[PDB]
Amino acid sequence: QAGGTIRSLLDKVAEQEYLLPAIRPEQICRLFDSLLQGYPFGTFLFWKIKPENRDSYQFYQFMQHYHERDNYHCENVTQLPEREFIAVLDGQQRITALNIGLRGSFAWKLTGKWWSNPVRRLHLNLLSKPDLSMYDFEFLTDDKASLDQYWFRVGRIMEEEEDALIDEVADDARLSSEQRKEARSTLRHLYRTIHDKDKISFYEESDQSLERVLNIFIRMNSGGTTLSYSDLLLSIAVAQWSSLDAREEIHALVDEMNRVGDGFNVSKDLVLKAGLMLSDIGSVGFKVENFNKENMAILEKNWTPIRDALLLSMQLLASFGFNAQNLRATSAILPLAYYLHHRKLTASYLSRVEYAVDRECIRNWLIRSLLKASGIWGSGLDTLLTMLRSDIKQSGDTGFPLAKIEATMQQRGKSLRFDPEEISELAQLDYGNPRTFALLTLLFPGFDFSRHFHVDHIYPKGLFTRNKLAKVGVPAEQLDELIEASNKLPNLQLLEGTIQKMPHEWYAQQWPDVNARQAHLQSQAITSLPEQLNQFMDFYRERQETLLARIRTALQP
Amino acid sequence: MYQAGGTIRSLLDKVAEQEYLLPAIRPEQICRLFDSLLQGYPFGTFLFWKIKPENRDSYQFYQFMQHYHERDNYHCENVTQLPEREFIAVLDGQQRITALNIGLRGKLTGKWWSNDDAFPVRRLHLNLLSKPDLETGSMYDFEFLTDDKASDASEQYWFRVGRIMEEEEDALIDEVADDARLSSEQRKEARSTLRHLYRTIHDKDKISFYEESDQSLERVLNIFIRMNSGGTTLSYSDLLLSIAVAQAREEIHALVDEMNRVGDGFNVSKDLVLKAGLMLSDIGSVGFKVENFNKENMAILEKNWTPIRDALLLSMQLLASFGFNAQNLRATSAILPLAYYLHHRKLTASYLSRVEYAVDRECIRNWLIRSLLKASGIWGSGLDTLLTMLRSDIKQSGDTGFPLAKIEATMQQRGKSLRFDPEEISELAQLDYGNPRTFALLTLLFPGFDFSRHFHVDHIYPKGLFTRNKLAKVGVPAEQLDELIEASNKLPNLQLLEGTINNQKRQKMPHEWYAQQWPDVNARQAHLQSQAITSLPEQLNQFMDFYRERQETLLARIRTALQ
Ligand SMILES: [Cl-]
């Protein structure tokens, strides 16, 4: 146990003496800042395998070079060490983070534009300046760090000797006198922390008594680790209620809400934030300051109406057929739940046709809010929720105020008016985008979303395989130029009911009536259906031009 | 602020001064911590919350526990005196400080009414002549003892760890020195130990903490979790040693969930499946240790996987055919022997319907119920060894069926006997509504019942009629009151009722519900005589006359059914 060095540990990892029994870049950079800032590491748990049990278990190596496509699974042990070896039971991620940073690489898929066709390594600015962080660490590509901020690869601390690196900086003339001075202090801090410092601590033990020492660690070190601000806040908040049955009631509603229809995944966090919003509390932040005794008193005095409304909220989203896979913005339920609370609406709201227009007004808003790439439900959300809540109080007594909510949102910069580019992106959306279902719900508003339904390909994806298209006679150049489009909105439609024929056959053995067939089709924006698969592209580009103009109109206010 | 420095005396002294508080609400466990403390094992970093007096009256803080009383103080007391200056609310380390506090600063019949003889005050003690117990792996002996059980074992000198905080070092080192009860050489050993304690509670920096304000709790919290435990440490997840060697995580979770949904419900753990793995795959060692989870052992397990998966499910269903649920089967470690029997004989759901297995299922149930009625450790200690021997018995007798004869005798040799002692019999007749053992006793004493169809335990005389005030209308001595209301929950007022909660009976008194729902004189007479009800008083005043008469009727059946 006692103490130890990061260099010592990283090297036993390399010699494969430190292993792993079975089992975010920016976050690795954050460990390294905290480390160089002197935030100490906690104690780690280690298991020493007797040489007799060397073959008894299947150990795996830590990750050094990460590639989401190439190496993403912890590689198995290559050469079983010839002597005593250790397997880590706690601190795996902490160790892996140091390994990737000082001896490895990280390749993550770049977020590209919607038109789509990189091994980076850890670097530190020696002329690091603080940011209200203290030390700027970034995973960068070599050419992006050669930028004419003096960037240094932290990895060389493990490959070169201090004297060489200290000297390179001093012999660099791109740097002025005062600069080289700062750079040296910083480079030294790094070398003198990865090397020459007692940061690692480790409870170690053998097979027989491993049972006892894991439990000592759990008593002495933490048990039931804080789920961040979240379980803390819940803990803090529940501790200001008369009912010592409060903790449960929240978890209970969360469960009921997540079994409303086909299924949802809200968090206790949403319930707490909703509580604040519905209680007309002036701040809606998820902060312990806002979960005081006075604030939580209001919630406890109004819990039953608030719970009911949030449940009806999910019931309404499922009336519009949302589930855990298509609704990604749980933050959008909050305005809706304030509305059902302001008007004290009940389950009857979903049935009475008298409220049908208002339900379709809400859906218009929700869909358009979720169709925006991003910017509506992310940053600045707390100011928005506040101003949206306000709108509902001043003019919701009549009905949902879309006119006002639309412009309040424009003012906070979060307009729901789509640009020609945002519209062009929406017309090439892929099958998997959660935004796809909802675009179709808007474009095709007549459906019983309240009942089972799904999204399918007019021309089935099965036929879209390189051989099959070529058997029919598609230029080899156009192969794989169609298979990609087979999964794009112009070949996507909304169908009634749960989940082998070309569309024009299914549509003539299921739509015998010429007049009714022509209608279902024009209603699904299917203007024509060509019989040779080698004419699908003329179809695709035709439906798109039709849908593009239908998307513009449907998002015009 | 990261105070790496800090002593236990300082913490506890700030705890007593009500400056260290809590925002939100077992002895042996506390005792294990104290041994490890003196074994040098350090504490983890704690997280503390600074409260400026501008927000002092806004969050309802609570004190740590010191003198615990299941009946009186079982919840952290509210703040008696709020401090005027800045103060702290612990977020991490809540339990660890609450073990030091109670440690250095403070029954079985569960006759809840009795204040006396029913809540003995025990305080932490240490044997200064402690010695290595290579079984527990302990090197220091800490037990919670009462003053009498603390005062002449030749090698046990008990020191109340509490005086360390009230007396002076010199004084205690002197008391041990001027104690003629001790022997010269053994006086030296005591001193060395007493010193380590005084010098660990004081004079040694063991407490470490992060004191943070509201402004930046979010950030430093996150920083703490990065550098410290974020994966909530771990568990004895030997399941990993197998998803690895075997070529699974899903299958286990599946058996667990399916087994937990068989009847009205069960709450089994992944642990049982794995333990049954070794039990049913004939591995000579059933320990949940990592040693038996070897590549070659886990080879037999995946071959017997389909065979065991079924038996564990068949086991759970047999239990639900006996009315068992999460609420009434706390000792889930008793399923393991049952599963071996089903696997040995390769039975199926047809064991649950075919009348040819009735005598057999009833032999099993009797044993199971009897095993659970004992409040001692038939399924608490020496399990790996009992289970190992039961396996042998079941394997050598899987013909006529359950070797109950042999199983009882092997349990008797291992001291896990099921012959009931007269005193233990008497407490079974006084079992409360809550003790899960009660459900079973009723099913053992009333073996003719539809355990199959939905059923609930109810009270002959309804619980709602027993309110201090309600009994004054009928006129009862207020002398025996908080005890009469307790008897409303004991066995003589408890019965097995078919169906579910009948709100229509809670209102009526027994002679007003049986009298109508059972109109035939001959039928009622029997439904009742079968539920051990000889007479049913109609004046609530005579309840205690009914209780004693039934207790005598039930005591009779208990002695007949056991023994
Ligand atoms: Cl914000």
Residue numbers in the entry:
A (entry chain B): 3 to 25, 32 to 125, 130 to 144, 148 to 163, 167 to 517, 523 to 580
B (entry chain A): 1 to 25, 32 to 112, 117 to 161, 163 to 258, 264 to 579
Mind quoting what the paper says about this structure?
Using a suite of thirty environmentally-isolated coliphages, we demonstrate multi-layered and robust phage protection provided by a plasmid-encoded defence island that expresses both a type I BREX system and the novel GmrSD-family type IV DNA modification-dependent restriction enzyme, BrxU. The BrxU protein contains DUF262 and DUF1524 domains, and shares 13% amino acid sequence identity with the single polypeptide type IV restriction enzyme GmrSD. Our BrxU structures are the first for the GmrSD family, providing the highest resolution detail for the widespread DUF262 and DUF1524 domains.
Whilst using the first BrxU structure to analyse datasets from a range of BrxU crystals, a second dimeric structure with a differing conformation of BrxU was solved, this time to 2.85 Å. Our models described above for DNA-binding and dimer dissociation rely upon a great deal of flexibility. By aligning the two solved structures, domain movements were visualised within the BrxU dimer. The overall alignment provides an RMSD of 3.85 Å, indicating a poor average superposition. By aligning the lower resolution structure through one C-terminal domain of the higher resolution protomer, (which as independent domains aligned well at 0.58 Å), distinct relative movements of each of the other domains of the lower resolution structure can be observed. In this manner, we can see a 10 Å movement of the protomeric N-terminal domain, and corresponding shifts of 12 and 26 Å for the N-terminal and C-terminal domains of the second protomer, respectively. This level of movement confirms the flexibility of the BrxU dimer, and gives rise to an hypothesis that the 21 Å cleft might widen to accommodate a substrate DNA, with backbone phosphates supported by loops of the DUF1524 domain, as was seen for the observed sulphate and chloride ions. The structures reveal how nucleotide binding is blocked in the dimer form and reveals inherent flexibility that would allow for cycles of dimer separation.
